[model samples]
Target: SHMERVFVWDLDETIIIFHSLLTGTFASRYGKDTTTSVRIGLMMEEMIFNLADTHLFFNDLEDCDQIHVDDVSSDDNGQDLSTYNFSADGFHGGVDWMRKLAFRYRRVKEMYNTYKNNVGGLIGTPKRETWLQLRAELEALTDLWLTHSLKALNLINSRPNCVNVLVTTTQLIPALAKVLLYGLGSVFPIENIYSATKTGKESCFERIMQRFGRKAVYVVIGDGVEEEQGAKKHNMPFWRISCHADLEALRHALELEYL
Candidate 1:
């Protein structure tokens, strides 16, 4: 088989810049109103948590969190989960915790799959409309950072054997919730996302290597925090991105056959 090229992405600052906005760094650097940026960040943060808690049952499965959405697939005992009530039982750490969590993850994945088609079924119609407004506002507030990232992703996606895999430090539920809110649902699938919260990034990278093989080219793109070391451990090239200029340069390199 031919070798594949995997571009592993970081969600927060690397793509959406939500973390910088929350800390007021993004607004300060870009000469924007810090108060408004922070306010937007706070509201978006609240929305992320609320959506995960209410719709994705994140609160129910937080105790037995999954590193990746597919982590519990083997634990799933193939029981009929049609009538299974996730909230009925208080999850206080049990042997069947993984199985129950897997069921909830499946429901969340299903919701994610049909989010663009029927978001009202996942979240209420009122909330969905308000969230869309917030998403648009945030995009404008950040000067279309998310849009640029999407373009870069689309570029890589168009290239054969070059795929994007998201490895974020945040929890799986909130990360998925962010993907939906930031309009990044179409870029990275649920299976392509890896939450480095439970298992470390190095372990997640290893899992990716196992999936794609050692011969494939793995490029790690992030703000050079944990991902740098993670990439180092795997002997993969790490692309550091701090601003839009960096992202632009990355696209340039990709187009020019530099990467």
Candidate 2:
């Protein structure tokens, strides 16, 4: 089989539940408890923030939010950073920090790649166990929203010649962190994810089509008009995610090859 189909996905409300939890929208829409939803969102926020700051050099790269991992080589010369001192090499809005940030991005990507196949690789370790427990708790709290989405992606992935790609409007490092935290790194390779915050979804769509060539069928799936417009601009079909029913229908459609 060849790369015949590319299923482009949106991050926030389409696949995972983050912003909806923050605004109590999910609770209101689904008749769930708002306080619990808010707590879950806050808890998830703390974990993502800590992971980025402590491990991903987020503070140093905070200003360079617009830079994508693939666009790093312009400033990053592939220097050996195994022994690089991140604490001493302070961030001062200088251009050299781009390379350092790129190095950190590479590290984050490598971590995702390592842990993608498992539900956070090295499962028996101390910190790893905590992540697993947290993921379990969050899944239950969200009424298995995470698991449901994962199931959809797994099905799409199992289809021969079908590829799933992520295009998020968030920063690169944080998005990568989300993929890891949500146990979705297996379905979305680091290279298949795009940060569309700065470049916009249209440009991201164009780049993706270019990368995959024009011979494949491109489909956009999301909850907002941004992706719908992008899909329309590219003359691709769009599947909108508004509710669990919509998601279920999407799964069925995929099963039947409807889109």
Candidate 3:
């Protein structure tokens, strides 16, 4: 076959852990890391590991019904919505609002409204010289791993026409890329990877298709339904990386059929 493989990736729980549970604390957005601060009631966290619903079924606990946005009260866990600092840098050491990375801010703010909980909403959050303190913390992260979704990328990365693209809703592309590439041993070229806004995945896919050509085969490997929807939007195949064991099978199948 003469088909060229283009493996576009969703950079959250699909390849590595990118959800709220990574933190050693919860409601850390308030800078209050007491033992009880973490999401105690949110069940899907530890034992009920469901990457599929983390964004959907269990993301937010904010109740717009009981307490209004300006009311400053949590659902039932004493989590005041106003005190949580629904900003971009709130969790990573609190810039958000209409300041730096205006586009990023708009998206972050929207998710804050949608999810309400704002737990790990800062993943791939952005920074600048104007916000030097916050920028330092993000780049200081030297500890990042592929976790268990390790073997899949390596197999496809070695091919000539195949390239793996990291499509994320996160803002800090360069910041997260450092840790991401580090986890994969720099196999996937840095420039090839990209960080997208919350609704920018379709544009990113189109850009890839235009650059590579429609003749190339496009595959989106992700852990969320939204990613699947994005792939379908561009008429691409969506491969669900549901489990760590699935990585090997995913790579093997792709290589055997496409490579």
Candidate 4:
């Protein structure tokens, strides 16, 4: 059967919200109340450590190709020991590690890398447990946001034959699926959402086309410039929502039926 139009929504600021608790929370936790610049600097440093850890882990896994391998050694107590060597010169593992790290940890990494290289000394500090707690809290917030957003979407889904998918920079496929399941599984089918990682917006749209066929009409709702632009560039209808505080207004605005 010929397909109907598709609607792609950005996750971060369109359907949901992103407060950047990663940085803001870090600042608050470290008691960096000197200047905004100083606080930001501290936050950035913490970001670097987090990103560095993630990069190292991913790189090690990539080198081994298997997440767990028998060849990998352990201490006398069998603690699953492994050594990871990171090179200054670019290797695929190194490049992939940094690239993935950059997307997940962009703002803080940029802030810290810039400052550490240009400025000096360790600045903002965050406990590992605190960072983990903040991450958990953000995930919880995302769950809360998705629960309501999908409730709203389910209202629309019940009325129409429109296809639903989540288009996000926050890692594609399963990550989005997990969040959807956490929030809206009771309301909508898990197969309907989509997320795009470093793969770029065009590729994400293409994947949707490949799945649903190219002739399907499409609409997009999102807060970032990328999502709206992706819809426009792909010739789909688009809705741009405001980030942060104006979400309620955007929600009401999207309630207008497009017939």
Top lDDT prediction, candidate number:
1
Question: Model 1 lDDT vs. the true structure?
Answer: 0.83
Instruction: Pick the winner on lDDT between candidates 2 and 3.
Output: 2
lDDT string for model 2 (164-185, tens) is 9999998877887787778787
Q: What does candidate 1's lDDT look like per residue over 184-248, in tens digits?
A: 88778789999898788999999998998777889999985799999998799999988888888
User: Which of candidates 2 and 3 reaches a greater TM-score?
Assistant: 2
Please identify model 4 stretches exceeding 4 Å from their true place.
1-3, 25-148, 177-182, 243-259
Comparing 2 and 4 on lDDT, the stronger one:
2
Task: Provide the lDDT at 44 for model 2.
Answer: 79
The residue ranges of model 3 lying beyond 4 angstroms of the native Cα positions read: 23-147, 174-182, 255-258
TM-score of every candidate:
0.90, 0.87, 0.50, 0.46
Q: Give the Cα lDDT of each candidate.
A: 0.83, 0.79, 0.48, 0.47
Assess candidate 2 and give its TM-score to the true structure.
0.87
Best by TM-score: 1
Candidate 3, residues 22-94, lDDT tens digits: the string is 4632224333333332332132232222321232112222111111111221112332334333343432111
Candidate 4 TM-score, C-alpha based: 0.46
What value of lDDT does candidate 3 attain over all alpha carbons? Answer: 0.48
Candidate 3 RMSD to the real structure: 15.1
Using lDDT, rank the candidates from best to worst: 1, 2, 3, 4
Per-candidate total of colliding backbone pairs: 0, 0, 0, 5
